[PDB]
């Protein structure tokens, strides 16, 4: 251990937990070079993103294998398969872990020496080790009582010059602020109820959206029970977290319960030990998306409307039939109180380890793990038609363009079952010879993973608000699904050693995977790793290590990618489907993904060299690594021309490359006895480059995209995730071509490469003061890089609310370098046609001079990631009390974010498409980010 020949980072429980985050990975967001960590949103308590040395797999498995006490953990994600209309994320598998139960976390960043763990390790390993039994002075009880608040952070920057209206002209029913300039004048607004209409001063409500949000509240309770003997150790823990975030009502909720029992017993050569854990969660999400969702309704509010005034439903003007606008949006408070989107989960995981030392130098370890989960989701929406359409302005008075057509209600329930089994049988041989040392490990590993669900859906509810499968007069919808994959591999690992300073390691493994063709299921991968401590020098150099490694890691495909299938005939049409059966007849179609029985395995090959040194009395340290990864032949469903009879073919890709530098530098410029002061800086720079995608299929394939809109791709010579977007035409001198009649930009025929998803570099900056029992930590997270799509900016441009749209005071304008394109050869002429007041709305909604690509936003940000103020009480105070330790602790997270001036819209730490590669397409009006801060009380007994 720490004779390792590739990059890795150890973090200790206290740093993991001092932030009091509900989650074991969030607090490490910008603190480990090479390890990119992000939250999908600030909605409690959604998934988290952990990608190590860039995206190797497209698509879309790039999470690191989590290993707890020797056993692979399930890190499945539950997020919505349609982030356009119903965004929600219910959690990450790693989020079940109880912080406060972690004793050390070690992230193995390299994929050269991954025989001990399987092919899943190519994405990095997060090697978790839980607290065990220890003798202390008390009874062995640690209690943590937490409490925190979450207020909104970064709401879009709004224009406050123009109120409700369109085309420049005042309106009474708009969802936008393209109306006249604000004056004191008293104007009507809204709909008419009982021959009456509301009259309000036409003024701006600058804090109307800010005042809509609440302060989220979360209380946490953690208990641990601990003790040991010379033959035995026993740890038992419980954690409870309850969060209700800043969106009003309880629709943004997270309950978390964990229970754990860990014990070991030694008796002779024999040690037996077991770890068993139960994990519960309930989630409620304020769905996001382009439809009747809370936030999409919230942003399409004119700047003069008091949003906190739309809540009281006894004011009939706030009813869904008289709500002040009928334009694809309804009252946000009605959505939060009458829609359902719940998820509940039960999880059991654990292991049994049997250790038996024999013949002086041997150890037999048998370790089996089981991980099983049952999750149920229930979501519904009212029959808005039946309740409100008839005889109301927003319903019948808007005819077929009503927000209630055909919103007839639906309810669905899904129960999902997940079960993973791993078995390891190892013999370890460990013997010194002279100055040398030999340690060899041989073993067999066996893996079984299974997932199943049952889904049922009703539409057109009879009682309009009741969510139940009996509540429908129409045919219901069922779906069922399961996947089973199995793996067996055998592996050897030889660690050799000379003196205390020269370490060689040699791994190998060979796996048999069910997900590869029958006649090619076997794939072998070896590695080599060196470590040389060049500390052999007569105090100025505390430590001095040089590393090198070269190794491979194989990988298999996902389930069922080999044979042709026939699916139940359906057809996808824009915004709907036509599915069989009809009418009384069932039917099947040829599956549009072409399987391949000539696949080969995947093979990631990595080279890496590194350098670690420490100076003075450990007052200055640095670690630096240079890596070069190629994930080759990964099995992928590659895009194909539908005229071939299929829309994709499964085949082995070319290489995806990731090379770069990971750098950590820390030092203690002040170390008294009563006082310290540390500083830390870490730096990452990765160079993503898809090297080849099979030529025969064109060399490009979609990761995620909007039909006819902005799309993220993988292209043969470029970094992973390149955006193409809509762009205005230009003449040979670079002037923007505009339409001679409207004055509006004209599309440039083709898209439109406008950046990629990768940060150009990432880095973090941390300090840590310590006086007596006082301690303080301040962390900064800095990533400067690519671009993402932001519907938050899009909808706020379209709606006339973004400050950017108050440009030119909205007086008629000629685009400042316009040109008009003119028998059969082309001619360009200065443009004299202005954009009229009546069309300024459309200039900005389309994206201004940038057009569609306007809504790719600079991913960059600088963020005050976390702050921890710790108060460890003097032991003197506790002599007359049951307490062994009291640590009062005040903290804050995600406190402040600075972006470049081109991003006055979002905190870029957002997505609506999950926690992996597809989530890098961006945010589709995901809920705004939070400012989290609170207190923790720690009482040891």
């Amino acid at each position: 251990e720490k004779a390792l020949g590739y990059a890795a980072t150890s973090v200790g429980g206290e740093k993991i937990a001092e932030s009091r985050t509900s989650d074991v990975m969030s607090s490490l967001a910008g603190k480990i070079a090479g390890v990119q960590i992000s939250s999908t949103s600030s909605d409690p308590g959604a998934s988290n993103s952990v990608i190590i040395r860039g995206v190797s797999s497209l698509s879309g498995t790039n999470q690191p294998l989590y290993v707890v006490d020797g056993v692979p953990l399930n890190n499945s994600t539950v997020y919505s398969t349609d982030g356009l209309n119903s965004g929600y994320d219910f959690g990450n598998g790693a989020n079940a872990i109880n912080p406060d139960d972690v004793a050390n976390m070690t992230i193995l960043k390299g994929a050269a020496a991954t025989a001990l763990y399987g092919s899943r390790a190519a994405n990095g390993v997060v090697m978790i080790t839980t607290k065990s039994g220890r003798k202390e002075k008390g009874v062995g009880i640690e209690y943590n009582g937490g409490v925190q608040w979450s207020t909104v952070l970064r709401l879009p920057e709004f224009q406050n010059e123009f109120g409700m209206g369109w085309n420049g002209n005042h309106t009474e029913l708009e969802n936008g602020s393209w109306g006249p300039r604000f004056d004191g004048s008293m104007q009507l607004w809204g709909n008419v109820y009982n021959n009456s209409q509301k009259l309000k001063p036409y003024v701006a409500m600058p804090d109307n959206i800010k005042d809509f949000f609440d302060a989220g509240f979360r209380y946490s309770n953690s208990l641990s029970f601990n003790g040991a003997t010379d033959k035995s150790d026993y740890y038992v823990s419980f954690s409870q977290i309850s969060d209700d975030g800043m969106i009003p009502t309880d629709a943004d909720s997270y309950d978390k319960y964990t229970f754990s029992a860990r014990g070991s017993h030694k008796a002779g050569a024999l040690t037996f030990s077991s770890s068993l854990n139960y994990a519960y969660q309930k989630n409620n999400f304020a769905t996001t998306g382009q439809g009747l969702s809370m936030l999409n309704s919230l942003y399409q509010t004119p700047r003069d409307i008091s949003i906190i005034g739309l809540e009281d439903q006894n004011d009939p003007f706030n009813t869904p039939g008289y709500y002040y606008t009928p334009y694809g949006v309804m009252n946000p408070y009605y959505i939060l109180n009458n829609y359902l989107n719940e998820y509940e989960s039960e999880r059991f995981y654990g292991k049994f380890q049997l250790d038996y030392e024999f013949l002086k130098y041997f150890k037999f370890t048998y370790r089996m793990g089981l991980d099983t989960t049952t999750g149920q989701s229930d979501k519904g929406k009212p029959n808005l038609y039946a309740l409100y359409y008839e005889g109301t302005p927003n319903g019948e008075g808007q005819g077929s363009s009503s927000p209630f057509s055909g919103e007839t209600g639906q309810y669905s329930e899904q129960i999902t079952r997940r079960r993973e089994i791993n078995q390891d049988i190892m013999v370890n041989f460990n013997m010194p010879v002279n100055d040398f040392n030999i340690n060899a490990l041989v073993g067999f590993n066996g893996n079984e993973r299974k997932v199943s669900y049952q889904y049922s859906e009703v539409n057109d509810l009879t009682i309009p608000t009741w969510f139940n499968l009996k509540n429908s007069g129409k045919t219901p919808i069922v779906e069922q699904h399961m996947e089973l994959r199995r793996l067996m591999g055998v592996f050897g690992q030889f660690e050799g050693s000379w003196k205390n300073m020269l370490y060689l390691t040699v791994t190998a493994r060979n796996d048999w995977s069910s997900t590869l063709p029958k006649e090619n299921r076997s794939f072998f991968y070896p590695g080599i790793t060196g470590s040389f401590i060049f500390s052999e020098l007569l105090d100025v150099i505390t430590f001095g290590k040089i590393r090198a490694s070269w190794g491979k890691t194989g990988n298999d495909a996902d389930v069922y990618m080999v044979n042709p299938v026939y699916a139940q005939s359906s057809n996808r049409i824009p915004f709907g489907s036509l599915t069989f059966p009809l009418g009384g007849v069932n039917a099947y179609s040829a599956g549009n993904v072409l399987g391949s029985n000539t696949l080969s395995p995947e093979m990631t090959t990595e080279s890496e060299v590194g350098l670690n040194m420490a100076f003075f009395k450990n007052r200055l340290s640095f670690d630096v690594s240079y890596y070069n990864r190629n994930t080759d032949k990964q099995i992928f469903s590659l895009a194909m021309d539908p005229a071939s009879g299929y829309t994709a073919q499964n085949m082995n890709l070319g290489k995806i490359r990731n090379r770069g530098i990971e750098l950590l530098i820390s030092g203690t410029p002040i170390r008294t006895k009563d006082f310290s002061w540390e500083l830390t800086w870490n730096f990452t720079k990765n160079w993503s480059k898809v090297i080849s995608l099979p030529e025969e299929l064109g060399g490009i394939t979609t990761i995620y995209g909007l039909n006819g809109g902005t799309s993220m791709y993988a292209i043969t010579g470029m970094p992973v995730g390149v955006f193409k977007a809509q762009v205005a035409e230009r003449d040979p001198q670079g002037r923007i071509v505009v339409n001679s009649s409207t004055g509006l930009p004209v599309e440039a025929s083709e898209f439109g490469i406008c950046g990629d998803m990768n940060n150009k570099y990432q880095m973090g900056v941390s300090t840590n003061l310590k006086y007596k029992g006082i301690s303080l930590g301040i962390d900064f997270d800095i990533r400067q890089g690519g671009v993402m799509y932001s519907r938050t900016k899009d909808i706020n441009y379209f709606t006339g609310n973004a400050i950017q749209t108050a440009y030119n005071d909205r007086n008629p304008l000629i685009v400042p370098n316009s040109v008009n394109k003119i028998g059969e050869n082309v001619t360009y002429v200065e443009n004299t046609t202005p954009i009229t007041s009546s069309n300024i709305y459309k200039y900005w909604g389309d994206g201004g001079s940038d057009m569609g690509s306007c809504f790719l936003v600079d991913k960059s940000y600088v963020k005050l990631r976390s702050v921890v103020l710790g108060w460890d009480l003097p032991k003197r105070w506790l002599a007359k009390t049951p307490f062994q330790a009291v640590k009062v602790s005040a903290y804050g997270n995600n406190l402040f974010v600075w972006t470049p001036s081109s991003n006055t819209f979002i905190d870029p730490e957002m997505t609506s498409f999950g926690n992996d590669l597809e989530g890098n397409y961006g945010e589709y009006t995901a809920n705004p980010s939070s400012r989290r801060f609170g207190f923790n009380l720690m009482v040891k007994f």
Binding site: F575, G709, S711
Partner: peptide, 9 residues
């Protein structure tokens, strides 16, 4: 990819 819809105003 999959489709989105315009707004109203």
């Amino acid at each position: 990819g999959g489709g989105g819809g315009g707004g109203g105003g």
